[PDB]
Amino acid sequence: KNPKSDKFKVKRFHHIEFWCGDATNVARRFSWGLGMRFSAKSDLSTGNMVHASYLLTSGDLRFLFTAPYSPSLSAGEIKPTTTASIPSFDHGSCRSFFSSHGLGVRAVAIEVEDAESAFSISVANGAIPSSPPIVLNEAVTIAEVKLYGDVVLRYVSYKAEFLPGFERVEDASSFPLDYGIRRLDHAVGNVPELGPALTYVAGFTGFHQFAESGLNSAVLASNDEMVLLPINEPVHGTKRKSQIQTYLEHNEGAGLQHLALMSEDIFRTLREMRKRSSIGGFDFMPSPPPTYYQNLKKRVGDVLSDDQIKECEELGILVDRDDQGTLLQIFTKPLGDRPTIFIEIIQRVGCMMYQSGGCGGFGKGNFSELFKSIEEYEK
Amino acid sequence: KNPKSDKFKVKRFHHIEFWCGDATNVARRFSWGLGMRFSAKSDLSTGNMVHASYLLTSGDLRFLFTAPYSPSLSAGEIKPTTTASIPSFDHGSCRSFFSSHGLGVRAVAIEVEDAESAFSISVANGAIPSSPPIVLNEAVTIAEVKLYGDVVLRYVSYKAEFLPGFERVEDASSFPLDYGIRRLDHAVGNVPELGPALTYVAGFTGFHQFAESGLNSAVLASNDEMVLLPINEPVHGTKRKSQIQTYLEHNEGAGLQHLALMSEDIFRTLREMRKRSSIGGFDFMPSPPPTYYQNLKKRVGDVLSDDQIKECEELGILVDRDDQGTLLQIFTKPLGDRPTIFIEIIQRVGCMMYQSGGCGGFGKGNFSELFKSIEEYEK
Ligand SMILES: Cc1c(C(=O)c2c(C3CC3)[nH]n(C)c2=O)ccc2c1c(=O)n(CC1CC1)c(=O)n2C
Ligand SMILES: Cc1c(C(=O)c2c(C3CC3)[nH]n(C)c2=O)ccc2c1c(=O)n(CC1CC1)c(=O)n2C
Ligand SMILES: [Co+2]
Ligand SMILES: [Co+2]
């Protein structure tokens, strides 16, 4: 069931912010690898003496890449006189974040009706404040609370172009790449203990819980179930070591594990991304064995044709089925040096009337199907 | 003249090492932007719990990209029991380097006959030791001395595959990109005071000095003038602010300013790089005005045809002339967030009998030619 218990009005995912040591190189690699266009910047060329921030967009998906400049450039500034376009930015926090975790997500940003209200109600309901509400050029308000580890939930509200102080990039520099990615479907955290993490986040948002190998997890969802925030914990004591525990070890604790990006055509997206894997883009996890694709006919043969299921086989796409929809999904290798953050590409089919959130689930059934296919490929 | 005063036997440039916060993303961006292949790795997959290091190669050019892992992965190790493939690596030095300077060159590595001898003679002649000689698997010896700022000169000698502990990357991951770059021609440092820097470096190497707008510079060279190490200082008090001083400000002091990469066909290299500028590669400095290319006929018309000089005009190539050879050159925009390090692409024509080093100079004459062309394009 869906009690619609959101303690404030939540709209959609707004952006994901990566904290890096060099925003330029990460943003260029991601743009080519994922087919995202350069759309806005805030940096020295725009008067920002504090941080370099570059925004990539594909459909409604917004990826922001930020790194600190030398603190010496802004030594004369005080918070009232700052040239930073994102007032929550702090040199010491950013350098500490990146040296501790490496490349990763700092902020999961959701658009709300009123960011100051969302912040107040959140903290009144247990949220740990991270950055108080600040109004930007009488137009946009942003506030931040702690989510898990060093990741924050960022509230953004607009009265009536990304953020004040960001400039649109010249289209000579803005090449219209597009591989079909259209929006952020869900953002997943890894924590040591799932119980306290769930109680905390569900406590200050009012998100409700949305309807065996390595992990336990649960999905918090907004009223219309379009902001989806799953959380995982490790399952210790197994033959194979939990990838959640490996994450916590290499990340130095809790953090964002994967971003799932919805594509309007996952076959085109994966053809385009795989073309670029070895020339600067992203690698994908190893494909499942043919026994997997042999056994799909008897499970999804009603939704996908024999050509398409074979087209899944070339690209290594996995498929899972809910009682309401079907899910196409595939996972990249880790995005940076450490075995921590990765990306999932997904497409959902079903649950129409617009599409309802979570249609098809998150692919939990693909674990035992993978195990069964591996047990059957040695035969 | 060339006194051939090298205090030890120096061969050629061996590699350039970048210290980064995420080696993966920088190495992938550089590989696509410059047309360099992935050739070796030392990381978690090879047993290195200390640093991730990825090597790119194009012809004889070797770019190494290194970043630290969490120190927790190697907390039980001592220097005798280290899994680091580069024993000079230090987590604290690397994090301090990158937070201070951002993305930049840590090591300029030259191949010598005997790295222990080169280190001893260097320090006996004033070099500041950085890392003592260490023998790797009874096969390779590496030692490091301070060069300028936080940049070190790294000596490498081989008894008889990059370094012990590096693995060749699977050719499924190794795409054979090549845009024509073949070797490192020179590596240039920026310092506050040129005099003391020259006296220091020439003092411990025996390199000799190799034969007005913003800078003073001088070029130290090895016996055969194939290791070329120019150094710049700012010229203060001008109408336009020195780019050397801007470098020192944004870099937090002295460091490596530019790498010049020789191409066997600069026209093909710049066509290939410019195709990729807006899809993840490198941007170039603004092209000179047509008045420049109008005035080349009367200076290089004897070496380049009218088609090629027009082909220079499309690509924005600059041309300068020595009394012994001619030089084709162009500069990228800065490689990362800060206005610090950039790359020069060059091709030299002349001085044959093999090609002698520095053929054509370094393009000093292109300053006044550029000024004159700008004064003549408003007419
Ligand atoms: C991350 C993930 C998901 C997934 O996206 C989500 C889950 C799954 C319950 C985990 N719950 N929620 C909310 C999700 O968004 C689904 C299937 C997967 C994996 C995955 O990582 N590996 C490789 C790692 C195990 C070695 C797999 O083999 N399979 C089959
Ligand atoms: C770096 C550089 C070089 C060059 O490579 C080297 C030099 C030159 C004396 C500087 N000496 N040595 C040893 C060299 O390797 C040559 C010409 C240049 C520039 C350059 O940066 N800019 C733009 C900056 C000035 C605003 C220019 O307009 N011109 C024309
Ligand atoms: Co998922
Ligand atoms: Co040069």
Side-chain angles (χ1 to χ4, degrees), chain A residues 185-188 230 232 257-261 327 329 331 342-346 348 361-363:
Chain A
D185 186 86
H186 55 271
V188 174
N232 313 323
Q257 176 205 47
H258 76 271
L259 301 159
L261 321 178
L327 165 76
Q329 68 183 168
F331 304 99
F342 57 98
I343 276 171
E344 176 185 2
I345 313 289
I346 69 167
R348 299 188 184 278
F362 300 90

mmCIF file of all heavy atoms in Angstrom, chain A residues 185-188 230 232 257-261 327 329 331 342-346 348 361-363, ligand 3:
data_model
loop_
_atom_site.group_PDB
_atom_site.id
_atom_site.type_symbol
_atom_site.label_atom_id
_atom_site.label_comp_id
_atom_site.label_asym_id
_atom_site.label_seq_id
_atom_site.Cartn_x
_atom_site.Cartn_y
_atom_site.Cartn_z
ATOM 1 N N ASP A 185 16.243 7.143 -12.320
ATOM 2 C CA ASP A 185 15.184 6.285 -11.795
ATOM 3 C C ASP A 185 15.319 6.039 -10.296
ATOM 4 O O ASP A 185 14.330 6.153 -9.559
ATOM 5 C CB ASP A 185 15.166 4.951 -12.540
ATOM 6 C CG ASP A 185 13.987 4.078 -12.146
ATOM 7 O OD1 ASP A 185 12.890 4.238 -12.734
ATOM 8 O OD2 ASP A 185 14.162 3.230 -11.244
ATOM 9 N N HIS A 186 16.514 5.683 -9.819
ATOM 10 C CA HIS A 186 16.708 5.537 -8.380
ATOM 11 C C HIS A 186 18.179 5.711 -8.035
ATOM 12 O O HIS A 186 19.053 5.563 -8.884
ATOM 13 C CB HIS A 186 16.185 4.193 -7.846
ATOM 14 C CG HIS A 186 16.736 2.975 -8.529
ATOM 15 N ND1 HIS A 186 16.155 2.423 -9.651
ATOM 16 C CD2 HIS A 186 17.755 2.146 -8.193
ATOM 17 C CE1 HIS A 186 16.804 1.326 -9.992
ATOM 18 N NE2 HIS A 186 17.794 1.144 -9.136
ATOM 19 N N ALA A 187 18.430 6.039 -6.767
ATOM 20 C CA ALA A 187 19.775 6.237 -6.232
ATOM 21 C C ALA A 187 19.899 5.436 -4.946
ATOM 22 O O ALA A 187 19.080 5.593 -4.039
ATOM 23 C CB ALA A 187 20.069 7.715 -5.967
ATOM 24 N N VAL A 188 20.933 4.603 -4.861
ATOM 25 C CA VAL A 188 21.012 3.520 -3.888
ATOM 26 C C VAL A 188 22.191 3.768 -2.957
ATOM 27 O O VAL A 188 23.305 4.032 -3.423
ATOM 28 C CB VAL A 188 21.165 2.166 -4.599
ATOM 29 C CG1 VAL A 188 21.392 1.063 -3.576
ATOM 30 C CG2 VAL A 188 19.927 1.898 -5.481
ATOM 31 N N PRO A 230 16.606 3.473 -2.533
ATOM 32 C CA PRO A 230 16.944 2.199 -1.889
ATOM 33 C C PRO A 230 18.174 2.314 -0.994
ATOM 34 O O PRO A 230 19.061 3.144 -1.222
ATOM 35 C CB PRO A 230 17.222 1.276 -3.076
ATOM 36 C CG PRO A 230 16.567 1.961 -4.275
ATOM 37 C CD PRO A 230 16.741 3.412 -3.998
ATOM 38 N N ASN A 232 21.026 -0.461 1.129
ATOM 39 C CA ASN A 232 21.526 -1.822 1.317
ATOM 40 C C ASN A 232 22.404 -1.928 2.560
ATOM 41 O O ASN A 232 23.075 -0.969 2.952
ATOM 42 C CB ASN A 232 22.380 -2.309 0.131
ATOM 43 C CG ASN A 232 21.751 -2.041 -1.211
ATOM 44 O OD1 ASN A 232 20.537 -2.127 -1.368
ATOM 45 N ND2 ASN A 232 22.587 -1.744 -2.207
ATOM 46 N N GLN A 257 25.913 3.856 -3.645
ATOM 47 C CA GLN A 257 26.425 2.680 -4.343
ATOM 48 C C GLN A 257 26.178 2.740 -5.850
ATOM 49 O O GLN A 257 27.118 2.592 -6.636
ATOM 50 C CB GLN A 257 25.807 1.388 -3.800
ATOM 51 C CG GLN A 257 26.287 0.164 -4.606
ATOM 52 C CD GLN A 257 25.328 -1.010 -4.574
ATOM 53 O OE1 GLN A 257 24.126 -0.850 -4.771
ATOM 54 N NE2 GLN A 257 25.861 -2.202 -4.313
ATOM 55 N N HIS A 258 24.932 2.937 -6.285
ATOM 56 C CA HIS A 258 24.721 3.032 -7.722
ATOM 57 C C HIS A 258 23.614 4.019 -8.064
ATOM 58 O O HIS A 258 22.738 4.329 -7.251
ATOM 59 C CB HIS A 258 24.493 1.636 -8.368
ATOM 60 C CG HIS A 258 23.139 1.014 -8.149
ATOM 61 N ND1 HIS A 258 22.858 0.203 -7.069
ATOM 62 C CD2 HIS A 258 22.038 0.977 -8.941
ATOM 63 C CE1 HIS A 258 21.622 -0.256 -7.174
ATOM 64 N NE2 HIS A 258 21.101 0.203 -8.300
ATOM 65 N N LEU A 259 23.734 4.581 -9.263
ATOM 66 C CA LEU A 259 22.718 5.423 -9.877
ATOM 67 C C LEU A 259 22.092 4.620 -11.006
ATOM 68 O O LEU A 259 22.819 4.035 -11.809
ATOM 69 C CB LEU A 259 23.343 6.707 -10.432
ATOM 70 C CG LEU A 259 24.070 7.575 -9.408
ATOM 71 C CD1 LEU A 259 25.071 8.502 -10.066
ATOM 72 C CD2 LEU A 259 23.012 8.367 -8.614
ATOM 73 N N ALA A 260 20.761 4.573 -11.062
ATOM 74 C CA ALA A 260 20.067 3.911 -12.166
ATOM 75 C C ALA A 260 19.485 4.972 -13.084
ATOM 76 O O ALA A 260 18.665 5.791 -12.650
ATOM 77 C CB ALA A 260 18.959 2.988 -11.665
ATOM 78 N N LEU A 261 19.879 4.931 -14.357
ATOM 79 C CA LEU A 261 19.466 5.910 -15.352
ATOM 80 C C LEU A 261 18.496 5.246 -16.320
ATOM 81 O O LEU A 261 18.832 4.227 -16.930
ATOM 82 C CB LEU A 261 20.677 6.452 -16.110
ATOM 83 C CG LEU A 261 21.900 6.680 -15.208
ATOM 84 C CD1 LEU A 261 23.068 7.176 -16.034
ATOM 85 C CD2 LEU A 261 21.581 7.662 -14.120
ATOM 86 N N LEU A 327 11.344 -5.498 -16.418
ATOM 87 C CA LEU A 327 12.487 -4.604 -16.266
ATOM 88 C C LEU A 327 13.690 -5.103 -17.060
ATOM 89 O O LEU A 327 14.099 -6.261 -16.919
ATOM 90 C CB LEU A 327 12.845 -4.444 -14.778
ATOM 91 C CG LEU A 327 14.206 -3.842 -14.416
ATOM 92 C CD1 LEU A 327 14.177 -2.337 -14.637
ATOM 93 C CD2 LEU A 327 14.561 -4.154 -12.963
ATOM 94 N N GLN A 329 17.740 -4.359 -17.551
ATOM 95 C CA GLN A 329 18.781 -3.714 -16.747
ATOM 96 C C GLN A 329 20.171 -4.276 -17.040
ATOM 97 O O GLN A 329 20.329 -5.449 -17.377
ATOM 98 C CB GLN A 329 18.487 -3.862 -15.244
ATOM 99 C CG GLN A 329 18.608 -5.297 -14.760
ATOM 100 C CD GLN A 329 18.260 -5.486 -13.299
ATOM 101 O OE1 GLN A 329 18.106 -6.618 -12.838
ATOM 102 N NE2 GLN A 329 18.169 -4.385 -12.553
ATOM 103 N N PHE A 331 24.561 -3.365 -15.658
ATOM 104 C CA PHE A 331 25.399 -2.649 -14.704
ATOM 105 C C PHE A 331 26.768 -2.366 -15.306
ATOM 106 O O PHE A 331 27.360 -3.235 -15.953
ATOM 107 C CB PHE A 331 25.552 -3.464 -13.416
ATOM 108 C CG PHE A 331 24.239 -3.822 -12.780
ATOM 109 C CD1 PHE A 331 23.685 -5.081 -12.962
ATOM 110 C CD2 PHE A 331 23.550 -2.893 -12.025
ATOM 111 C CE1 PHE A 331 22.464 -5.410 -12.393
ATOM 112 C CE2 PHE A 331 22.324 -3.216 -11.448
ATOM 113 C CZ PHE A 331 21.783 -4.476 -11.641
ATOM 114 N N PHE A 342 28.915 2.564 -9.104
ATOM 115 C CA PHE A 342 28.712 2.146 -10.487
ATOM 116 C C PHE A 342 27.367 2.668 -10.974
ATOM 117 O O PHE A 342 26.576 3.247 -10.215
ATOM 118 C CB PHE A 342 28.807 0.616 -10.652
ATOM 119 C CG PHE A 342 27.843 -0.175 -9.783
ATOM 120 C CD1 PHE A 342 26.646 -0.651 -10.308
ATOM 121 C CD2 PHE A 342 28.159 -0.482 -8.469
ATOM 122 C CE1 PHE A 342 25.774 -1.394 -9.523
ATOM 123 C CE2 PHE A 342 27.292 -1.223 -7.689
ATOM 124 C CZ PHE A 342 26.101 -1.682 -8.217
ATOM 125 N N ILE A 343 27.103 2.459 -12.265
ATOM 126 C CA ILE A 343 25.864 2.930 -12.870
ATOM 127 C C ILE A 343 25.070 1.731 -13.379
ATOM 128 O O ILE A 343 25.634 0.714 -13.793
ATOM 129 C CB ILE A 343 26.157 3.956 -14.000
ATOM 130 C CG1 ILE A 343 26.344 5.352 -13.382
ATOM 131 C CG2 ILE A 343 25.057 3.949 -15.112
ATOM 132 C CD1 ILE A 343 26.847 6.407 -14.331
ATOM 133 N N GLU A 344 23.751 1.839 -13.288
ATOM 134 C CA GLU A 344 22.830 0.868 -13.865
ATOM 135 C C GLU A 344 22.063 1.560 -14.979
ATOM 136 O O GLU A 344 21.605 2.693 -14.804
ATOM 137 C CB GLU A 344 21.872 0.331 -12.791
ATOM 138 C CG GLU A 344 20.795 -0.631 -13.294
ATOM 139 C CD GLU A 344 19.815 -1.024 -12.181
ATOM 140 O OE1 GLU A 344 19.964 -0.509 -11.048
ATOM 141 O OE2 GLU A 344 18.896 -1.834 -12.428
ATOM 142 N N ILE A 345 21.936 0.902 -16.136
ATOM 143 C CA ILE A 345 21.050 1.386 -17.179
ATOM 144 C C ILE A 345 19.801 0.522 -17.138
ATOM 145 O O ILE A 345 19.897 -0.704 -16.997
ATOM 146 C CB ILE A 345 21.713 1.324 -18.567
ATOM 147 C CG1 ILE A 345 23.131 1.915 -18.513
ATOM 148 C CG2 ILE A 345 20.833 2.037 -19.599
ATOM 149 C CD1 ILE A 345 23.190 3.415 -18.347
ATOM 150 N N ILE A 346 18.628 1.147 -17.234
ATOM 151 C CA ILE A 346 17.373 0.409 -17.133
ATOM 152 C C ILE A 346 16.357 0.951 -18.123
ATOM 153 O O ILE A 346 16.399 2.110 -18.544
ATOM 154 C CB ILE A 346 16.721 0.433 -15.725
ATOM 155 C CG1 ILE A 346 16.208 1.821 -15.377
ATOM 156 C CG2 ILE A 346 17.680 -0.001 -14.644
ATOM 157 C CD1 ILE A 346 15.308 1.792 -14.179
ATOM 158 N N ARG A 348 11.941 0.281 -18.311
ATOM 159 C CA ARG A 348 10.769 -0.343 -17.719
ATOM 160 C C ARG A 348 9.643 -0.421 -18.742
ATOM 161 O O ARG A 348 9.434 0.511 -19.526
ATOM 162 C CB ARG A 348 10.287 0.444 -16.502
ATOM 163 C CG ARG A 348 11.306 0.552 -15.385
ATOM 164 C CD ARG A 348 10.660 1.167 -14.155
ATOM 165 N NE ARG A 348 11.595 1.395 -13.065
ATOM 166 C CZ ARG A 348 11.985 0.464 -12.197
ATOM 167 N NH1 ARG A 348 11.537 -0.780 -12.301
ATOM 168 N NH2 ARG A 348 12.828 0.778 -11.222
ATOM 169 N N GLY A 361 9.995 -3.540 -10.568
ATOM 170 C CA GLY A 361 10.868 -3.735 -9.428
ATOM 171 C C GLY A 361 12.283 -3.269 -9.719
ATOM 172 O O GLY A 361 12.519 -2.338 -10.489
ATOM 173 N N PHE A 362 13.240 -3.945 -9.092
ATOM 174 C CA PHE A 362 14.636 -3.538 -9.168
ATOM 175 C C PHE A 362 15.542 -4.687 -9.583
ATOM 176 O O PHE A 362 16.773 -4.531 -9.586
ATOM 177 C CB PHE A 362 15.065 -2.940 -7.822
ATOM 178 C CG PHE A 362 14.250 -1.739 -7.421
ATOM 179 C CD1 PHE A 362 13.097 -1.888 -6.660
ATOM 180 C CD2 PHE A 362 14.602 -0.465 -7.844
ATOM 181 C CE1 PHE A 362 12.331 -0.793 -6.310
ATOM 182 C CE2 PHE A 362 13.838 0.640 -7.490
ATOM 183 C CZ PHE A 362 12.702 0.472 -6.724
ATOM 184 N N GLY A 363 14.967 -5.827 -9.958
ATOM 185 C CA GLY A 363 15.742 -6.928 -10.492
ATOM 186 C C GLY A 363 16.200 -7.925 -9.461
ATOM 187 O O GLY A 363 17.178 -8.639 -9.705
HETATM 188 CO CO CO C 3 19.117 -0.725 -9.105
#
